[PDB]
Each structure stands twice: as C-alpha cells, then as structure tokens.
Structure 1
Amino acid sequence: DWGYDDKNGPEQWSKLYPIANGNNQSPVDIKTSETKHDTSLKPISVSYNPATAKEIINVGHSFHVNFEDNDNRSVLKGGPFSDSYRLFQFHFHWGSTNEHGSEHTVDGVKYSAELHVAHWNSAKYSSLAEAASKADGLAVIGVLMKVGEANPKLQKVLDALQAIKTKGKRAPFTNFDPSTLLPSSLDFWTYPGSLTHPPLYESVTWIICKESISVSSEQLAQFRSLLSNVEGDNAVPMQHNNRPTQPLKGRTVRASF
C-alpha cells in the first residue's frame, strides 16, 4: 500500500517498488540552459472525440477522468512519435499550498498544479495493460498550472467532483474534449521517463508544454476538498499528490522550440 503521507510516501516507495531509484524516473527539473533543441521533433497533433469521455472516479490519492479506449477516435500524433497513441485518461496533481503542487519544475520553479493527459501505444500494443510497462508504451502531455485567474475550461471537471467526494465513488462523465484544457501553444520539452507514482514503470515519453494554463486559488481548494476516505468515515482531505523531482541520470531533455 502506497500514498503521499508520512508512512507510505514518495521516500518510502522504493521499499515496495525498487524502480523508484531507477534511471528514467519522473518528474524532473527541466533546466532550460541544459535542454537540446531537436529539429526532428514534429508538432504535437491531438485529435480527441468528445464522445470518448466515459467516467470520473475518486481513486483515493487523486481522481481520474477515463476515456473509452477501444478504437482510434481520440489520438495523439507528431512530436517525437511515429506511432499513433490512444487517449485513455486525464488527471491532476496538486500540493498542500499554492507555492507547490506541480510535479515537473522548470529551472527550479514550482507551479501550483499539473494536468496530465495520458495515452497508450495502440500501433504497437493491443491494450493499456500490455502497453503500461513497455519503454514506448505510454505518452503523457504534462501542463503546468499557474495560480491566478479562474480557468473556465476546468468547470465541468470541477462541477463533477461533488458526485465523487469519497474514495471509490464514480460517475459518468461524458461529452468532453480534454484538448480544451491544453495551452494555445503546443511548444514542448520531451524526455524518456516514468509514471510518477507506483507502479512507477519507465514506460512514459513525456511531453511537457512550455506554456502554462491558469487555475484560481479557489479551484485548487476544490481539488483539496476531495476526500481520501470512504463514505461514512472521518473526512480526510486529499491535500497533496505531487512527487518530488528525480535525478536526470544522463538523460537529455529535448526542446521543440
């Protein structure tokens, strides 16, 4: 059993998951002076079908918005990829205070939250479960969220949280295109990395947007208002779910810009 508290947190994870001290761990600090511009990086092409939106679920440490992933209605293309990747999910990470909460940092700068839009390699693999542990199995768009103005595009997501307040609760969440949450510029960093929580597989090609999106201090409070406990128990708010940045270990972060 793992979490983000004292006993079961990021510093304890290695005890059950030795890959935590691996060579391709995420998130990282992106140092802009150390990034290598790569001229082969194509533009990011996302093409998502609103009808693939399926369900929202309170997973105890976080919440997920899952998508139907049986066909190629919702796909990521371009960037560092030859393979088309299929959308299956988006979720957020946040912190105890506005001062932190993002997973990735840029030149030491911590943002207030981070949006992850995750995809799996359906050109190569037959399922998420197969893809999940493969070097080229996963592609995740990471978007830094900067505290400021309320983000109207977050609304439907925020409004759905009242129906999944406690652990294990789930509800339909339909007719939503998560490319509406993405920044208007898709300029990006890319590097080979991992899932940022157990099982911490080194299967993720990260796409980190240069441009941030907004979130208000109140919108952040709604995330932290979600409960980690099951219905009927003592209310335990999901205060934070961000992993500390990890050693780059010789990896190079490429820039598309």
Structure 2
Amino acid sequence: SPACAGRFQSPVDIRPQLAAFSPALRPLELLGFQLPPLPELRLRNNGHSVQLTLPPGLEMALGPGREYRALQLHLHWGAAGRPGSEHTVEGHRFPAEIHVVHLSTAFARVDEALGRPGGLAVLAAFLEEGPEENSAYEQLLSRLEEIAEEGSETQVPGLDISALLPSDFSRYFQYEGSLTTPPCAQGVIWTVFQQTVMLSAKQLHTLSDTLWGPGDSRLQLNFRATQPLNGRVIEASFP
C-alpha cells in the first residue's frame, strides 16, 4: 500500500517539550460507552492483534462539532520483559497500548473516510503495571485462551468500554497521522492520553503470552516502528 510510504505516518515519538500548548483542546466527551451485558460483542484474534468490535451508539466528541462513532478497539503489546506500545514518550516504550478507532459522523463507511481530513479518530492510552487486577481488562483478558488460535473469535458480554481508558479525559496530546496497518491512510486524528491505565503483572503476561499469530509463532511485539514527525507539531491540552 503506497500510503504506508506517506510523509505523515503514525506512530510517533512524543517529546512533550516540543509539544504545543493549545487551550482550544477541551476534555474529550464519550456517550453510550456504558453497555448492557446483552447483546454480546465479538472478540477476535485476527493474527495481528486482539480486537473487540463495538456496537452502534458509542458517540465520542473531540470538541463542539467534532463528532465520531466508535467502531472497534484493539491492543498492542510486547513480550516477557519487552515493552510493546506503539507511541513512545521521550524514547520510552510502555508495556502495551489500547487504540479505540472511530468514524466521523459525516461518513457512513470507513472506505469513504480513509485519507479524508479528520475522517477517522483514534483514542490511545498506554497500559502499565499496577498492583491490582484491572477488572474491566479482566473481562477481555480472561477470554484470550479461547481465542489463542490465529483467526479465532468468541463472544463477550458488554461492559463499560470507558473503563478500559484512563479516567482523566482532560490531559492529552493530539496530532494528525495515519493508520499503522496497511493501508496506512493519512488524515487520522490521534489522541494520546497523558494518564496511563494500570494492569497487574499477571494481566500483562496473559496479554503477551496467550495468543498465536501466522504459522506457529506467538503473537507478540505487534507494534510499528516510530515514524518521524517530519515537521508536524504535536499539540497538548495542558502547558
């Protein structure tokens, strides 16, 4: 895919000292993320990541008049004693990263949004080790064994999707970039939370050690190398 050779790709190394403070960046707003248990959602090992397909009615705004609907979420992760976030901060790679991918309400389908400015928006948070079992994450992680095989899927009860994200929606970096998988189309608005989410050591081990990918290989280290900013300026919602 030729867009994988674009000048403005993701992910990137975030250098907060070079980030631009912009007070137009208000707290993110999420609506409908607190799901009932039924209907169930589909959790799939696609051989490259674990992805959770989201139902209609999850609305996200980056600001007034900047409205999106959530499509899916997926994870990026490393391996035993090796971090696997996609984004880095000052060259630091975090253990894992969650991405929640959204479609602008001006478009009915992803294929019309691809490459259009602000057509797609991704919410990204780093996952780090904390002392406690994260109960929202446990609902997904406890099902990975069921989908160990490449191309397998299982149904899971609806949960509070917003509980997979940090509680602080006010402090984030934002920049324009790309999908990180072919076709790497540009125009994607990336939002990366400052606050991280905490999983237990056991949870992080389940995530990195359970799933299999193409041809008898463990699905691990499933992150793209850092791409140059190439003159883009990362914005921050805080000085």
Fold match by TM threshold 0.5: yes
The one-letter code matched in structure 2 to 1:101 is G
Q: Which has the higher strand share?
A: 2
The answer to whether the Cα contact below 8 Å between 2:34 and 2:162 also exists between their aligned partners in 1 is no
Q: Match of 1:252?
A: 233
Q: Report the RMSD for the aligned CA atoms in angstroms.
A: 1.8
Q: Match of 1:137?
A: 119
Q: Please list every run of at least 4 consecutive aligned residues from structure 1 whose deviation after the TM superposition is greater than 6 angstroms.
A: none
Q: CA deviation at 1:183?
A: 1.0
Cα distance in structure 2, aligned partners of 1:180 and 1:169 = 25
Q: CA deviation digits over 1:159-203, x for unaligned, max 9? A: 122221212211222322210111121211000011112111113
Query: What is the aligned length?
Result: 232
What secondary structure is seen at the aligned counterpart in 2 of 1:144?
strand
Question: Aligned residues: percent identity?
Answer: 33
Cα distance in structure 2, aligned partners of 1:102 and 1:196 = 12
Task: Report whether the alignment pairs 1:58 with 2:26.
Answer: no
Q: Which has the higher contact order (CA 8 A, sep 6+)?
A: 2
Cα distance in structure 1, aligned partners of 2:120 and 2:79 = 28
Matches for 1:27-46 after TM superposition, within 5 Å: 27-46=11-30
Matches for 1:85-234 after TM superposition, within 5 Å: 85-122=68-105, 124-149=106-131, 150-186=133-169, 187-224=171-208, 225-229=210-214
- Segments of structure 2 that go 5 or more residues without pairing to the other structure are none
The answer to whether the Cα contact below 8 Å between 1:30 and 1:107 also exists between their aligned partners in 2 is yes
Residues 25 and 97 (structure 1), Cα distance of their counterparts in 2 relative to 1, 3 Å cut: farther
Cα distance in structure 1, aligned partners of 2:182 and 2:200 = 29
TM-score when normalising by structure 1: 0.84
Q: CA deviation at 1:93?
A: 0.1
What secondary structure is seen at the aligned counterpart in 1 of 2:207?
helix
Q: CA deviation at 1:49?
A: 4.4
